[PDB]
Fold:
Amino acid sequence: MRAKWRKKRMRRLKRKRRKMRQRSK
Amino acid sequence: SLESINSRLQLVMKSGKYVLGYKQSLKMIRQGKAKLVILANNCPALRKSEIEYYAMLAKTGVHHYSGNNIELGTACGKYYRVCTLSIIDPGDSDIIRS
Amino acid sequence: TKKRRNNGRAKKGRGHVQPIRCTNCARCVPKDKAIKKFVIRNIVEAAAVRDISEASVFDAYVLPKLYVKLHYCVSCAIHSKVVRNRSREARKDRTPPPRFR
Amino acid sequence: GRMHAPGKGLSQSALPYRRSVPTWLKLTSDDVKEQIYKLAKKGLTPSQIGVILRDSHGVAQVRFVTGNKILRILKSKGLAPDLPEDLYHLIKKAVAVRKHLERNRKDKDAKFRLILIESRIHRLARYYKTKRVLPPNWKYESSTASALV
Amino acid sequence: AKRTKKVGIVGKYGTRYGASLRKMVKKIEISQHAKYTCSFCGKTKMKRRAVGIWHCGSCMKTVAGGAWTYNTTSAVTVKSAIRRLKELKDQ
Amino acid sequence: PLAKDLLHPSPEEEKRKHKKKRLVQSPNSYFMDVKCPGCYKITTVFSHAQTVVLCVGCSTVLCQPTGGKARLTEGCSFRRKQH
Amino acid sequence: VRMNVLADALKSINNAEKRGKRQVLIRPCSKVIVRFLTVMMKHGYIGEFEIIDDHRAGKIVVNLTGRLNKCGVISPRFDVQLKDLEKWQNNLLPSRQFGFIVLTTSAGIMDHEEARRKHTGGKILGFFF
Amino acid sequence: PGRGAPLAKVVFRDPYRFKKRTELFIAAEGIHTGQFVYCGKKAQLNIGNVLPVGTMPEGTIVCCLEEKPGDRGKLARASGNYATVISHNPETKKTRVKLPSGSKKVISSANRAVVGVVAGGGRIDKPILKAGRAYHKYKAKRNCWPRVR
Amino acid sequence: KTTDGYLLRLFCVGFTKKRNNQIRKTSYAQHQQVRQIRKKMMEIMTREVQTNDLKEVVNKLIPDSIGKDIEKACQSIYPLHDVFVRKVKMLKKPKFELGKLMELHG
RNA sequence: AAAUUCUUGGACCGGCGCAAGACGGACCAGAGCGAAAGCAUUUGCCAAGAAUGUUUUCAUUAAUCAAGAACGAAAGUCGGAGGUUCGAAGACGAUCAGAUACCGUCGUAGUUCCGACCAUAAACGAUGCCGACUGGCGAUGCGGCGGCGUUAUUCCCAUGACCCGCCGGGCAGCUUCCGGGAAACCAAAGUCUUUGGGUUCCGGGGGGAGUAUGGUUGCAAAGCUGAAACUUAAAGGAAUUGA
RNA sequence: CACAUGUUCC
Ligand SMILES: [Zn+2]
Ligand SMILES: [Zn+2]
Structure:
């Protein structure tokens, strides 16, 4: 794992948590 | 040489005698006291031709100023627009010799 | 660690220089970082320079040359053996190789 | 070491050691002052009287010939201007940049340059507040500064 | 005090028409009722009376301009371009 | 080298050093007695006068502003003075 | 800019002493520096100094001997009591046989032995040995 | 009413009878009341001055262009629209002129057009917000607004 | 444009020359010198072309008579040596009538 | 290497033109300017700027700065204009065990211009800013000073182009046992156990983790601040010898 | 034009 793509994986995972938390409210 | 004229105007305001406005300056041309006329470029064309005709009879030099009346008041150190300026006494300036 | 004091480029006070492409590939290389070769060469070198001369209509006609300013990248120049790696003391030498042939 | 530039240049005047009047100068203190009063009457900032006097009139320094300096002589007779010369030329420069910024609002370099004079104007403004040469409530206002030349 | 946070003239529209439509209207809606500096008198008395006309409250002088702004960006470029070719013809 | 004569610097290198960086701060400018060929009167002119100089009666110009020393008008005799 | 003046003078002659210059020039002349130089001369640590008094902050040319190891400066000028003056010289001077801490008192500027004789404290200036 | 382009009343002098003739022109942007608008072949090139296309230089911005010689202007006369001169042709008296649709049309050099863009430009950038603004817009023009799919 | 309707776009090139006794490798010129060179370097074309028609300026292109004058006139600014006019381009011709071509063809 | 692709409906190529939109080669440099990002066709306009020169003016007006503010590569977003070339996505043809990659033909967004956001880069000299001292050597940019001389305007003074030096800083380079550092190396990374010129920011083994939560900005993407539970005896830097 | 990968102790 390159340090660049694990940051990109985090942003895709963080954005996934953004949609999941938004639909509950 | 435009910046030199603003320096001449500033010098006349603090020391020499001057008349602001159109109507009050038209009397001074008629009494013959004024020697130099300053006219903004945005003055009415009828008023531009009448001032030069009044000064031609009085043998008074007219200097057509570069900009409009809004900046002409700031060049005179005032806070209002001026279209016609007549210098009664330069006092300590060389504005009439240029 | 630091390999080169100038980091393999001539940029000292600029901070940013315009990039140029390469000759073999289309690699975007900075102008001061690129290995720049300027070759003065004839169109024909050894064999064709002779037979065309008597075949030329105009006697004693000098053949025009060809001027190409080459721009190689680090990978391209080394693979094409334009430049090669040197020892740590031999790196600091920047004089050109001797020119006689 | 300029305070708003990365330059560290060294170029300024260097007065000679002797404070005595030059031997070629025959103009007395009052004759220099009436020459100073002549230049100040026709309109001239005290920087320029010192310039042309050493060029044509041949004086070394006004402080050595007379008892006082150029601005101090004008202050005694009341011919000094309302506000000092270094603040005046900064406000004049700030007006020209702002006037240029009215037309060329894409000039981000000129936009950055504008704050530097207003930074420099305020440093001179609060310094002159402590020296009591300006009123204590004086404040450089950008819109009404165009009235001053 | 400041009555609204980030809506100005488009506060009369309420929650209708959406945020983006109210946002892009705001630039035009402000400019179509703002006053501009008279080129003849100097008094800022350029008020829009109808579509494409701009009237002076001092000189009683109507100037044909843009629909929302006093001068459109295209027309200013045309005026500079026509003047440039005017002196190019007669030299 | 270690030992130097900072007590009494030599004339040759004192003029070489920068005017502020001298042991005693001394200027490189001077004054001269300019006499134009058009007239007779003697005028005192700064060496870096950086301004236009005109003769008495507006006869002829004397010095032109430059980046350094003022360029004398040709044919004007000048004699450097000191005090 | 130039915040402290004595600090620049002491480090300039310390750099010359490390290189071993016969004499050294310092650009500012102050009353404190002149008093500082007179403290070291009575003990013979340096060669004889002279000042060049122009119409500005003068320049001081100090002849140097080879007897100087290091002349430091303490900034800021902490006040020194008579009780902890032994504590100051314990961690600053190399030994108790030599080394001199000079500090300004109301009686004047002198080393730490003379301040003990006059029983007067003050603010510290620097150390030299 | 029903037209976004403003109209200007221009009064002429009849050269054959003692009378003043008024016209209804399409106001170019920049036209003010009390301004001499010229009309003819020997006219000068400035905004609000109609003259034949064959006399114009290259790339002249025009509006109210005639598509035939003598039909009083038909092309490029909506609000904010204009036409440009592409290329002249001295023989056959023809000139290429492009239209606001982008198509390039060869037109005769005898017909004329008024120099400038039509005033009232930029009308379509403002979004209609409610049905009322669109209802009142088409009510002045014709019964064509309520569109059933 | 010439006296007749031959309107031309000319092109010239200049090159600063390293002096014979010059030791300095750079041999560059100031930006204002280039602007002072090129203002003299352009007006020479307007002097040679405007005074006559194509028959003489073409006769000036067989030698470097336009480029020789450019080289010597700008010696007081910077001694440039390698001067030629590099490109002459036709832009607009007048109506072709055959009588003009005959005196150009004998 | 082939194929995808065009081609007797004439492809490719040559010549004459026309139109569109990009870009500014060689000159171009361990050169110049700019706070940085960054800046390369000619000319004109506007304002600004460093350095030099100064026996010109004021007289401490100064240095670093939290809060705050301006600018801020590319990519990305929203409105228009335009879209030549290149080209994320995608389609197709090759290669391979597979390519969803590297190769080739197209090609949306984008790359181009204007008006607003966005404030992130290996945004590097991986080296905060102001002041002083500490060896030389040859260059180079600018300005100034002096001097034999060669060469232009020609009609020489003076100005240009060279040559020989000096001065200030401007980017750098070379060199050595100053000195320092773990070493690589450094005229600063020195003037430090002989430890203090001044003033900000910032780090405390490695992960978790720039994560969760809270606050704040943004149209969005995301930007700023920012843990703990738990886990681990090493991780890491320079240098030598083998492989 | 392809050459992908081979548990732990000294
Ligand atoms: Zn390459
Ligand atoms: Zn009006």
Observations:
- The first strand of chain H starts at residue 7 and ends at 13.
